[PDB]
Symmetry: D3
């Protein structure tokens, strides 16, 4: 009946963090996380691409109205993450190390509480232009 496609939107947020696990010693944390372990933290301009998939509406031509996607991303990414210190301002990271992997997972989870079932396809997080994580709910 209807064609299926993937629709993506990109957004970026600014945040600080420090890679550190209290399960690891002061020295193991330094060895494992290196410079990212700097005691006072550091930061990034994160770029997030959220992809949803579904059938293309025969009337509107939309898999999902980009206005709605913007709103979901505002709620799932921008409000809790933008201009925040991940480890101190985001409850989820009080006990989870804020690697790019876990930021992708956190965003995936947040989006799932809001998006229609089966809509979310992928969450791609660029920590820098050179470090990227793709999480697809697996």
């Amino acid at each position: 009946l209807r064609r299926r496609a993937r629709l993506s939107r990109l957004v970026s947020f600014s945040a600080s963090h420090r890679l550190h696990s209290p399960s690891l010693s002061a020295e193991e944390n330094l060895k494992v996380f290196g410079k990212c372990n700097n005691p006072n933290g550091h930061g990034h301009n994160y770029k997030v691409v959220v992809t949803i998939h579904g059938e293309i509406d025969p009337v509107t031509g939309m898999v999902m109205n980009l206005t709605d996607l913007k709103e979901y991303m505002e709620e799932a990414i921008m409000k809790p993450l933008d201009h925040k210190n991940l480890d101190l301002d985001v409850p989820y990271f009080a006990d989870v190390v804020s690697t790019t992997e876990n930021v992708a997972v956190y965003i995936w989870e947040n989006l799932q509480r809001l998006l229609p079932v089966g809509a979310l396809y992928k969450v791609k997080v660029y920590e820098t232009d050179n470090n990227i994580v793709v999480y697809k709910g697996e």
Copy 2:
């Protein structure tokens, strides 16, 4: 026998359009398409990445000669879409809303009339740097 790979080429074209469905009222169109419904239209520098897949030739080292891909894309994308008004200059859009989704579908279809069977893998269309559609023939 032979290794398989995906080969992609990017091209960009300039076009104007207006998101509007005559199945929707003047006001519903405004609600659904917002600013994209501007009566006199607006435009974009579309970026299209076309991916074909196949075995890597044991002699030439090519999945498909990029010269041929350029030619197919010139014919399928540039000739009908570049420096055009999608809704008024492209017959296909006389009755289809010109969303990014439908531009990807249109390009996929165009390429299929020309490419060897099983060659086309994906058509990725960037309407802006922030709005992207991936269509894989599903």
Copy 3:
């Protein structure tokens, strides 16, 4: 004294247009404007970088509060140009060809009506990644 610096902000707007001069005939307009003379128009995702200059405030560390710069650009660029047909929705282009040069000049003039005297340093307009105009009020 106080240190002087240049502060720039980038914005993108979507718009369509047709390069056409009523002073020229149908054949001249084609010769001069080529593919951009497409009767039904075409469009671009314009990127504009606005640079203002001045002294770095000794308390706030700002040449101009970027919040303020955003508002100025919102009023001078986004509001009148975003998602518009330059030649039909913008009075200025009624009798002025909408080349990248004239868009840069139009934006410069709009900002000058709003900005503090001497604040504006440069307006840079990318019609595409390859076609760029810089205007400095000269």
Copy 4:
């Protein structure tokens, strides 16, 4: 038990090469490879994105420590390829045409000698911004 994700790192290297097969005549090589057949060669700033996949560590939050990935890529890509003439400085290309396809294959193979089994997911090679090859070991 544990979430799985894809982790990617990008690196770029500079290299010269000439597309030419001694199985093809002087003239066939010209027809097939065109400008890329220039007798004295030409060059590129290659961009390579290497993706590995696996479970996200419950303690460190890493699929693979980026420090390790950097080291593997230094060894598999940078040492043999950076600031080299592919056809004359890389033994593998003495008998294989240095197309983007074969550079991706070469890097995939190199990484396989070093990476833990099942870690490598994809090798994406940008010869230019417009010519890209994705090889996934198929």
Copy 5:
């Protein structure tokens, strides 16, 4: 005579900060700095372009050996700023608000202590792709 040219090198550093002035009160700092006044900070992937000018050497063809330029920038930018909290790890920012303007000024001053007299021409700092400051020692 000898030809004169401008030679630029780009580097990126990761850092966090809070825009906050002790001269201002809690409410003023919020008014002035908005979201960047987040108590626990935030961060960016800063990009810095350093331009030096001078004569093109008649033997080496260099204005300055880029190896040398790299070292200068490594000492002036990377070492003191990369993976740091600007306001707590950099003495200069103890009593100077860390806007993009002051980061550009701080970098300019660091380079001036190291570079040959008259070599430095410009320091360009991108806090984000959209917020840019150019400092030329004025």
Copy 6:
């Protein structure tokens, strides 16, 4: 009077080279040129931005017809440099080290033979995204 503006056009060419001076010995060339002194060469995807300046025509709205600018650049840059080995295929580099500086100078000189007197304002050459030279005929 007539308004004056700067019109820029970007092009990319692929080329290889070896940084080596016959005036220097084998050890000096290694010290000075390092990895770029690789005997068999290496290459880059050079990006060149050409800026011309002048009055904005009152009828066409152009400083110079971009069609014309394209042709000039095609003749001055693409034709002699694209898909070439700079030191063996370009006579100018027979006795001139092919640094980014000399490539910018060579391009400037080529454009000056073709362009209207006083039209050329700047030649910007990116050897890589990180190494840039600006030449203004000084």
